[PDB]
Design a protein around this ligand. Sequence first.
Ligand SMILES: CCCCCCCCCCCCCCCCCC(=O)OC[C@H](COP(=O)([O-])OCC(O)COP(=O)([O-])OC[C@@H](COC(=O)CCCCCCCCCCCCCCCCC)OC(=O)CCCCCCCCCCCCCCCCC)OC(=O)CCCCCCCCCCCCCCCCC
Ligand SMILES: CCCCCCCCCCCCCCCCCC(=O)OC[C@H](COP(=O)([O-])OCC(O)COP(=O)([O-])OC[C@@H](COC(=O)CCCCCCCCCCCCCCCCC)OC(=O)CCCCCCCCCCCCCCCCC)OC(=O)CCCCCCCCCCCCCCCCC
Ligand SMILES: CCCCCCCCCCCCCCCCCC(=O)OC[C@H](COP(=O)([O-])OCC(O)COP(=O)([O-])OC[C@@H](COC(=O)CCCCCCCCCCCCCCCCC)OC(=O)CCCCCCCCCCCCCCCCC)OC(=O)CCCCCCCCCCCCCCCCC
Ligand SMILES: COC1=C(OC)C(=O)C(C/C=C(\C)CC/C=C(\C)CC/C=C(\C)CC/C=C(\C)CC/C=C(\C)CC/C=C(\C)CC/C=C(\C)CCC=C(C)C)=C(C)C1=O
Ligand SMILES: COC1=C(OC)C(=O)C(C/C=C(\C)CC/C=C(\C)CC/C=C(\C)CC/C=C(\C)CC/C=C(\C)CC/C=C(\C)CC/C=C(\C)CCC=C(C)C)=C(C)C1=O
Ligand code: HEC
Ligand code: HEM
Ligand code: HEM
Ligand code: HEM
Ligand code: HEM
Lengths: 92, 354, 354, 117, 55, 95, 241, 92
Amino acid sequence: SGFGTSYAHDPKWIEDWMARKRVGVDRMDWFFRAFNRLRLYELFFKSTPRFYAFMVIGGLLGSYYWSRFWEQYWIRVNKGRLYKDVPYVYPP
Amino acid sequence: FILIIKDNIILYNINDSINYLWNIGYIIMVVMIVQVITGIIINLYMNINNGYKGIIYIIKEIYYGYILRYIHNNNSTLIYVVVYLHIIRNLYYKTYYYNILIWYSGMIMLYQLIIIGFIGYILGWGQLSYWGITVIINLISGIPYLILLISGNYYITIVTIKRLYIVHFILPIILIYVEIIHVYYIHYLINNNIVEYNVNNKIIFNNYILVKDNNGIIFILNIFILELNNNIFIIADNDNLIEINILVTPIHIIPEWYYLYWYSILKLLPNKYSGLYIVVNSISIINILSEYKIVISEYKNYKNIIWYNQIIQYISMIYIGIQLPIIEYINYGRYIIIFNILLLIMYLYPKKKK
Amino acid sequence: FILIIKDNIILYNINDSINYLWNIGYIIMVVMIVQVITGIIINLYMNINNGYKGIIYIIKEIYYGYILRYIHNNNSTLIYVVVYLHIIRNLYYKTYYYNILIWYSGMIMLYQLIIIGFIGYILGWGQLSYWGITVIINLISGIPYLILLISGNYYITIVTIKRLYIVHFILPIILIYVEIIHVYYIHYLINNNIVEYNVNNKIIFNNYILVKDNNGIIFILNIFILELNNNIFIIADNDNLIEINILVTPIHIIPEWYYLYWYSILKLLPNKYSGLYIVVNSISIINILSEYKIVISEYKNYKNIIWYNQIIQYISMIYIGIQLPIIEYINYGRYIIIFNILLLIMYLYPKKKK
Amino acid sequence: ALVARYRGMGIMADDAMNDKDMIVERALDIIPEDIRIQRYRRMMRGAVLAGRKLHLPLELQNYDPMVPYMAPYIEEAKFQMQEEQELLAYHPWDRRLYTAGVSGFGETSMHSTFLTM
Amino acid sequence: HYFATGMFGLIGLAFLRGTVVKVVHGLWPARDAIAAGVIEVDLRGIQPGQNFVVK
Amino acid sequence: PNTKRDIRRLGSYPVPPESKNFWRGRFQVPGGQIQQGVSPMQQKIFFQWWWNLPTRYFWRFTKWSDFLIPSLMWYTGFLMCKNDVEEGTRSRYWY
Amino acid sequence: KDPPSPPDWPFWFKAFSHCHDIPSCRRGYEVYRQVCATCHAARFVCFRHMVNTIYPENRVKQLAASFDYEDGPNDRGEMFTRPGNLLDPFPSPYPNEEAARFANQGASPPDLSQQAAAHHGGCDYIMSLLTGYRDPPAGVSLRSGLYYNTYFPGGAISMPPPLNDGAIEYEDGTPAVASQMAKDVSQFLTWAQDPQHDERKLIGLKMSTAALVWLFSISVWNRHVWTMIKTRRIDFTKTVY
Amino acid sequence: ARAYCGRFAFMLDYPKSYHPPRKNEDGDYVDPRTDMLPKCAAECSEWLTEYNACVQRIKMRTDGRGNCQGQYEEFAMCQDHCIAHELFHYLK
Ligand SMILES: CCCCCCCCCCCCCCCCCC(=O)OC[C@H](COP(=O)([O-])OCC(O)COP(=O)([O-])OC[C@@H](COC(=O)CCCCCCCCCCCCCCCCC)OC(=O)CCCCCCCCCCCCCCCCC)OC(=O)CCCCCCCCCCCCCCCCC
Ligand SMILES: CCCCCCCCCCCCCCCCCC(=O)OC[C@H](COP(=O)([O-])OCC(O)COP(=O)([O-])OC[C@@H](COC(=O)CCCCCCCCCCCCCCCCC)OC(=O)CCCCCCCCCCCCCCCCC)OC(=O)CCCCCCCCCCCCCCCCC
Ligand SMILES: CCCCCCCCCCCCCCCCCC(=O)OC[C@H](COP(=O)([O-])OCC(O)COP(=O)([O-])OC[C@@H](COC(=O)CCCCCCCCCCCCCCCCC)OC(=O)CCCCCCCCCCCCCCCCC)OC(=O)CCCCCCCCCCCCCCCCC
Ligand SMILES: COC1=C(OC)C(=O)C(C/C=C(\C)CC/C=C(\C)CC/C=C(\C)CC/C=C(\C)CC/C=C(\C)CC/C=C(\C)CC/C=C(\C)CCC=C(C)C)=C(C)C1=O
Ligand SMILES: COC1=C(OC)C(=O)C(C/C=C(\C)CC/C=C(\C)CC/C=C(\C)CC/C=C(\C)CC/C=C(\C)CC/C=C(\C)CC/C=C(\C)CCC=C(C)C)=C(C)C1=O
Ligand code: HEC
Ligand code: HEM
Ligand code: HEM
Ligand code: HEM
Ligand code: HEM
């Protein structure tokens, strides 16, 4: 309360919010536990030359299939309005 | 120079308490590099004898030449947005109070940028380009034979374009040099903090500040890419795609959005020279804001009322520039100019003692 | 940077015993500045769409434009004369023996200069310009699709001129930067003297060496002004004042005088690639002349027989380039090439012990 | 508003002075250690609070931030500086230029300008 | 953590490669030039013994 | 750099050439301090954003409310001018 | 006093992931060839621009071959006439501006190469202008050869109303009405201004989406490193472990 | 620089379906816009009454001076805004 004055102070519900520290709670540990089983760190990240290769080879493959995915998205959205979708009929 | 890089990037210390408003300077440096690079590449294909037909040639015939054309035009808008926001930032925290040398080095880059952007606009060689430079050059018609020497003819022609192109090619390179004087003074005269005083909480730049600066510059890139490819904001007037006709004026003769503030000042004041002088006043007067103070204080972290009125005053003046020369707008614009003068006097004047 | 200037000009110490051959470097630095300045000014008037008609326009219509045209052409000849004489100087005293870093920094500027001068010659847009670049570019026809990317078409056109112009505008600026690395290494790695050993007779540069350097540069100016205004030496081939005809070749296809040595090497060797490789050999082989020596000596101040034969060998190869492709000249030129290889082997080989 | 801002940071008004001002720097040279210790601790807490976008607990905010604890030392510093101004800096002195790392135009620290790098 | 910093590099390198290749691509002969560099000869209408010239 | 007292070094080891700026920002800590931290690899890296979220925005808005009256006055000026312009145009031109 | 602003017409290509509607572009070119081309020129539009984008190559050759272009010199130094080819620009009705003004009562029909983006409102201006021809406002009398258009600056345009129902027969069979023709020609002229419009947006889509993923990675990195800083505890007279 | 400002498709109200234009007694399709003119005029009745008043005021002038272009432009802008919302539904 006191919003907009020199008496402004945090309301009660903000104080309660900051009283919830979630000490000793980890609801996302499953994600990291399962991610670690991919062994990406042991195989690629730990060694600098392999870390570079991951960025290069990943960027190569990632860039190609990223382009491929959105090209299909474009073709679906503009279905029936593309030059390839409407073969031209020559006048007689 | 690997030990100079290490002393200014790796082991450079900055306060932890700075906001994202301290990331603006880094963004200016990066986008400035891009503008220089895309300019050099664009000149591999550009035709200076007819700038109108060169742009068409780049957009249609060059592979990915549309990217170069639109990046250079749109990134210039981004350069002025980021620079003006940096100026507003410096005004708000009154960083000029003690780091005046940093403020002076910056203002030089501001003066150069104004010339760079304007001439570049002329290189488009459209209706607004031809008529914009014709109007501005007439301001110096008082000085004898000065217009003829600058234009190289009795009217603007390709002769003028050839010489202005050299200034546009070279001046940005000098601007980059001044950026080194700016960074030298920043690193020697330590940066200001969100708090008035100087405190012992600095951390190295490369591991912490650079990561945060990249996050900001990538966030601005997500916005710039949307504008670049889809034109979500109209930042270029359409009238510059009309071929030049020296006998017929366009519907309106206005510069890019980032020159609107100065354009309205001229359009408002009745005497032409007075308009030019008021333009000189606004940029120069803000260089001595703190020079007359006598108290031990930097006027920092008060309610900053005068600051806010000044920022809105810039916005309103920019709005009046867009409108036609209606008489009613002229009256209100003049009040804004008077109001702006009073605000500056508030900044300058020292206080007496009760 | 006034304390850096004072440490490298005012309180910079050099031996008293140096000759006027140590003034060549200063002359290169000064004439280089002039070439950059006159180039920028010339581009205020030059037309890149037709370089042939631009030169005529500058010579006839611009006030004192003939001075800019002839200075830029003639000062390029002076840049190569002074640089080649500096190379001969360094070879004679074997300054590369201990100051190899200075030699390496210099060679980079030599490589850049070769590219700068050649493209500039093309910007004239005459018969020799068109046919010279056509012949040289065919040397890389082995690499697939490389000619098309460089030329921007299937034949040399204004498209090629536009892109080469940007390299000619920018590369000289990079060359000036390398001159700072060259001067840095000269000031750190002290200069050589006319005597082999290092002796305690140094004097400050500004009061003594600069006065002597100005005397030399003013003496060279008296000669350059005579050539500039009266053309006492034919240093530009007349065939470049003929308009380009892509179907008819000129009487002879040769570069400026300062490329004649490399031109003859290609014209002599039967296989095109071998000719290119021998060109690569001559510039690169002189970078490792002292690398295989094992004795405590710099081979300095002997009768320098091998040196003299090499200098005359350059002169004779330059002479053969001027002549038509007569069979007899081809034979003798090949002997000179073989002779040059033997001379270089004499430089490289270390000596056994009796 | 200013009193609230100081109380939120838990600092005094005299803490807010910037030592880039020379009078403040000369005054800070002579302040006693007990005053110095608490000044440093208050200023450090304020910057942590401001940087983390937090405010001092209200339990600790009941104090007068406008107590002028630096006044005795600011006045001494001004006296010392006025004596130096008058007895030692009453004329524009001529010195050899750009020598010993200093421009010769008056500044006393080496490498403290762009032209003395 | 290293996956996240790796992904920053992965995307950055892909954007860098696209930029470089696109710029160099602009130097290839332009669409007007490539088009002009191909002439089709309609051998229809020529008569035996006739010589024609195509630029 | 900081004050002369702050940057006055206790050790006689020379300042490395790559740490010149780092040692110009030195502070002379009075009374000592204990600094503690934990590596980010053993901490929650996003919770603090959520924990501080409501107080951050409350204090931001209460500070920005100081500009409410100025902005309304400028906005009031914006409306008067816009409608003064319309009336002028109609009076001078419309019939 | 500035010209009335055009309304926002819902063209397909206005959305972020939408292309130029090729069937409408095809119909737009028919309108331009048979109506607009009599007075206007498209100097910077070439037939090759339409190949494999609007029409197949053989069809574009037939269109170009319909026109005659002055070409030369021949071996005798004479200028001859030849049928068009893919390299030629669209034909110009008049040889120069003076000729155009004389045939149009002193008004110069502007080149339509960039007119789709040369007016405030862009493509909307073209659609609105063509359909903006109304009877004059009461009290406004126009000299002969001037017509009332709500969107032309000043209200009086020297262009006769160019679109009339049934003016042309669409090849695809779409009903030919004034509004339809205005929509199509506006579409076509928008394409002509920037034929690389579709390429720009498709590549922009890949960049924009990728940039969002890039923002998440740097954000995670930024959060990770700054946790070391924002959770530190500095104590003076206290100690907690 | 460019013809249009891009937007999300949900912001763009592109017609979902196509209604063919009405056919005349003669058998020629009637312009959809002309059919929509009377409706959009009614939706802009307020501006139309202001224009109608101006016509009568200038009619009762001994002098020849007087125009109603300003009111007509406001009416025309309103009518066209109405047409834009529904016209493309009748156009292929
Ligand atoms: C200073 C400030 C900054 C300045 C910056 C500069 C600014 C300058 C100004 C601006 C100038 C204007 C231009 C600006 C442009 C800006 C825009 C831009 O750049 O856009 C570019 C670009 C725009 O798109 P685009 O460029 O049109 O797209 C191009 C295509 O996509 C792809 O391209 P493509 O189609 O051309 O190429 C595709 C092709 C490319 O192909 C390749 O490159 C592949 C081939 C490589 C071969 C390598 C071989 C190497 C080894 C050689 C042999 C060595 C032997 C050594 C032996 C030594 C012995 C001593 O790849 C493929 O086809 C893919 C398949 C490859 C299969 C390879 C199989 C290999 C087999 C090998 C067998 C060998 C066996 C031999 C055995 C015998 C031996 C004897 O941007 C992007 O696309 C952005 C992409 C970003 C990344 C997206 C991915 C995100 C991933 C997210 C992951 C997180 C989510 C996880 C979810 C998990 C769920 C659980
Ligand atoms: C209708 C037609 C109308 C026609 C009208 C025609 C009118 C013609 C106007 C002609 C110009 C008149 C200018 C009057 C200015 C009066 C200012 C004043 O009240 O000064 C009191 C003021 C004293 O202030 P204070 O607070 O009492 O004490 C100052 C110290 O804090 C503490 O002071 P301290 O005394 O305790 O400290 C000791 C030290 C204090 O030393 C200083 O204060 C020196 C400050 C640093 C100066 C160097 C700055 C760095 C270089 C800047 C330039 C960079 C680029 C240059 C090259 C570019 C090439 C492209 O004093 C000395 O060393 C005494 C001897 C000084 C002379 C040494 C001679 C050798 C060095 C040569 C340079 C200095 C020449 C004298 C100044 C010239 C002023 C124009 O003294 C100065 O202003 C010192 C000079 C600083 C300005 C130098 C400007 C140089 C020219 C730059 C270009 C300007 C273009 C813009 C338009 C110019 C036309 C207006
Ligand atoms: C109603 C009509 C009104 C008309 C309005 C216009 C009025 C006319 C005058 C306007 C200009 C005023 C000039 C003031 C000079 C002040 C001198 C001075 O005291 O300097 C030291 C002083 C520092 O004070 P301090 O610390 O007390 O001095 C003690 C230290 O010893 C100081 O030492 P320090 O080191 O600490 O500081 C020195 C400082 C001094 O410098 C500055 O701060 C900048 C000063 C100059 C400003 C720029 C002037 C530009 C104008 C001339 C050009 C015009 C061209 C026109 C052509 C037209 C053609 C058509 O920094 C430097 O010296 C940097 C030098 C960097 C040089 C780098 C060069 C490149 C590398 C080397 C060469 C290349 C490599 C070799 C290549 C070889 C090839 C082989 O400077 C400043 O604090 C002021 C800086 C300037 C601030 C802005 C001034 C605004 C003036 C008010 C009017 C503005 C009106 C609006 C204009 C709008 C334009 C678009
Ligand atoms: C008519 O409508 C209107 C507009 O639209 C048309 C407007 O834009 C505007 C606002 C426009 C502006 C505020 C800017 C207008 C800009 C104009 C007219 C630019 C004209 C062109 C020039 C000034 C080019 C000449 C370039 C210079 C003088 C250099 C500029 C930079 C300077 C002086 C800073 C420091 C100096 C340099 C960097 C020069 C360096 C010199 C060298 C390196 C020389 C070295 C030489 C040797 C021998 C070593 C208004 C008010 C308006 O009314
Ligand atoms: C046919 O008759 C003949 C002649 O007359 C025609 C001859 O002249 C000759 C002799 C001719 C020669 C020896 C020279 C011929 C020169 C030619 C063909 C030049 C062709 C044009 C070029 C090479 C331009 C391309 C430019 C470059 C590659 C730069 C050259 C300089 C280099 C590589 C040195 C170091 C690199 C640089 C300075 C580049 C710097 C790069 C940057 C700043 C990029 C920065 C980028 C980012 C993203 C930050 C012969 C043999 C002949 O037979
Ligand atoms: C076919 C349907 C069209 C289209 C799409 C356009 N026109 Fe015309 N036009 C003509 C003239 C003399 C002018 C000059 C302007 C004026 O008359 O004062 C124009 C102008 C245009 C424009 C630009 C409008 C403006 O802002 O200047 C546009 C976009 C345009 N036209 C499109 C003359 C003619 C014709 C001669 C009878 C014909 C037929 C057309 N125009 C047909 C078309
Ligand atoms: C801060 C730096 C610069 C900015 C603000 C800037 C600004 C601009 C502007 C606004 C345009 C015209 C936009 C349009 O056509 O409507 C332009 C055009 C141009 N600029 Fe720059 N420019 C800068 C740097 C450079 C540099 C370094 C070069 C060359 C090395 C360059 C070369 C060009 C060229 C060739 C054009 C003509 C192409 C055009 O039509 O856009 N610019 N500039
Ligand atoms: C080409 C334009 C410029 C660039 C490249 C640039 C860059 C920078 C950067 C990197 C910083 C340090 C980090 C930061 O505080 O964000 C900074 C600081 C600063 N700049 Fe600039 N700047 C430019 C323009 C200006 C201008 C025009 C002014 C003055 C009107 C200015 C005044 C300042 C000030 C006062 C600071 C100190 C910031 C502080 O103390 O916290 N700058 N600038
Ligand atoms: C070491 C530096 C340079 C040398 C060796 C050099 C060499 C030359 C040569 C030989 C010519 C042609 C001479 C003739 O026309 O027959 C030329 C032309 C030209 N150069 Fe340079 N140049 C250099 C630097 C520059 C620079 C820095 C610029 C521009 C900033 C420049 C701009 C021009 C222009 C515009 C031309 C065409 C004018 C002409 O026909 O001479 N040059 N250059
Ligand atoms: C742009 C061309 C260059 C310029 C500006 C230049 C300038 C200089 C200058 C000023 C000096 C010092 C004074 C002198 O000894 O005369 C020097 C020294 C030297 N330069 Fe260069 N140089 C250039 C080209 C080269 C090249 C191509 C080489 C090597 C092939 C070279 C090798 C050396 C060496 C070895 C020295 C040492 C001189 C000694 O020890 O006495 N320079 N140069």
